[PDB]
């Protein structure tokens with residue numbers, strides 16, 4: 001409608017990472033429409049915080065997409081929409097290939113028929129599988145070990161072939177462990193059920209869980225527990241705005257790791273929570289979770305070099321403080 005402003009469709013905008021990206025996009029001057037089926041996102045946060053149009057529907061719904069891309073002009077699509085429970089992807093892969101692969105292919109075909117040729121894709125370091133070096137560079141081989149990682153790898157391949165055939169320009173982002181919350185408490189992680197370490201740590205401190213389980217204490221790690229590269233969701237949002245601007249200025253297709261290049265062990269994260277909250281956190285040492293590699297850390301140099309991305313909230317204390325502020329308000 002307004003004659004200058006770029007118009008962005010954000011699928012999965014009602015979820016964790018996507019809501020923060022929508023806030024940064026609005027605040028950087030883009031018109032945003034959200035497409036989300038609300039299977040895990042939250043309408044109330046879109047309506048009362050993001051204040052953008054919400055289209056409730058499925059990325060795999062071709063008749064809906066055809067109507068949507070005809071009703072309004074879009075310069076680009078950002079695709080956060082997916083299922084991402086790794087254990088359920090092993091249990092029930094059909095649903096994961098349907099949602100994550102078929103749903104993305106349907107979205108891509110509708111885009112091409114509407115002549116939208118700019119795409120930003122939420123991929124994952126689960127596509128690497130067991131790493132051989134660390135920090136992991138973008139050109140490390142990709143041998144995912146669960147169907148979730150395989151679905152994300154399949155889409156990365158589809159995007160490459162769609163570039164060759166149709167000129168689709170896409171930025172693929174391989175996130176590491178998204179964490180944190182909007183510094184002002186407006187938005188944060190709200191997964192039901194919650195499985196991620198940092199929310200579970202903080203809900204233990206809040207008395208909403210009775211203890212935190214540590215999955216494995218015998219890894220080939222300095223302190224015996226798994227190491228992960230936690231990356232603040234405001235920092236991920238910033239890379240999306242930069243990626244978007246990079247493509248509107250005619251960037252070629254690119255893949256970037258989005259991590260800090262620093263890793264924290266499970267123990268360090270529990271310690272970080274004990275200091276930020278000042279509360280006691282009952283800990284229980286349990287067996288390994290199947291398929292957890294000991295250490296996953298991502299090199300963020302390419303994104304820093306090519307997009308000028310500088311993560312602002314790299315310290316675990318920043319990350320855990322913001323999350324703590326959100327969980328006290330949201331999960332009262």
Ligand SMILES: NC(=O)c1ccc[n+]([C@@H]2O[C@H](COP(=O)([O-])OP(=O)(O)OC[C@H]3O[C@@H](n4cnc5c(N)ncnc54)[C@H](O)[C@@H]3O)[C@@H](O)[C@H]2O)c1
Nearest residue numbers: 012015016017037038039040041058059081082122175178
């Ligand atoms: N949370 C992480 O640590 C991070 C790690 C790396 C990869 N990523 C990927 O980043 C993306 C977003 O991650 P998240 O934590 O915000 O998950 P999320 O569940 O909070 O957000 C996903 C949103 O997409 C919606 N959705 C799911 N399937 C849909 C469909 N077929 N059509 C329309 N909407 C649909 C869901 O309701 C949800 O609002 C995902 O693709 C995820 O795989 C997750």
Ligand SMILES: O=c1ccn([C@@H]2O[C@H](COP(=O)(O)OP(=O)(O)O[C@H]3O[C@H](CO)[C@@H](O)[C@H](O)[C@H]3O)[C@@H](O)[C@H]2O)c(=O)[nH]1
Nearest residue numbers: 084124125126176177195196197200213214215226266292
């Ligand atoms: O109650 C818990 C939860 C997690 N962990 C451990 O903490 C670490 C982080 O686990 P989690 O928060 O579940 O995230 P990841 O398994 O590392 O994977 C996340 O980040 C990956 C991208 O790197 C993606 O595969 C997924 O979308 C996303 O869930 C792991 O070593 C876990 O074994 C625990 O010890 N106890």
